[PDB]
Amino acid sequence: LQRAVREIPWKSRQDILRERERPVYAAECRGTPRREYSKNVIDGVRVKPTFNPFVKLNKAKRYVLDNWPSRNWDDWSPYRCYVRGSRRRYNIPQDLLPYKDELGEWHPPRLSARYQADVKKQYLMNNLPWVWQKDFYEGKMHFGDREPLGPKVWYRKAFREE
Amino acid sequence: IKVPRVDPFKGFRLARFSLHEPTMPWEKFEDEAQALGEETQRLERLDHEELSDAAAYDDMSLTDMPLTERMHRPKRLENFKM
């Protein structure tokens, strides 16, 4: 589990993107499952966001799946994606990046971070890691690994005990 | 409604949130070359031997077997039937 929750990606982006899996849906049992869906579970810890074959679609989710081209899995491509309910198809990653304007100064990306999040969600549902992150191949000094100082009152009490 | 009066785990401490460095208790107190060289060469020449089969790597002498292995390996091999 310690290794899995710290792995760093190493494969090429093209090879990773060649591994897309079309979503496949299967209903849950009538009662309750005997355990949790354990595709990416080690020692009871979910170490990766997993697409859920056993979703119970409500009206809103079904509307999104039925109407929005971005959820039409039969015409889905990682390099050309629709965002949320858009009808325009955006080039990935070229439209995720800031660009220079006619004055040569930086301009916000044609796709905002909010829509890039939807593209990431599409990737995850297609079982692809988000390879277009700025530092995809770099390990991170996770916030939870920092050594914490306990309450200062504890140290004051130790000083007074001394 | 009713609980035991004494909770025997109150006062639990997770780690050492100490004022001072975590110093180890030891810190307050701080011809034959021919045999050594012959042993080093004897060990070096072994690493360079061509193996007949890939599974014969650990076919070494008892004296050079690590002691714990010399005590436990017979039991492991007596229990691991082949």
């Binding site: 000094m141 050594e147 100082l149 140290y155 004051r156 | 975590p22």
Partner: peptide, 21 residues
């Protein structure tokens, strides 16, 4: 009463030194 403890500060600095060059 020093705060934060000097050993904690030095340990944090040493942990940061290799990662940050």
């Amino acid at each position: 009463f020093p705060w934060p403890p000097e050993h904690h500060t030095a340990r944090r600095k040493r942990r940061q030194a290799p990662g940050l060059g």
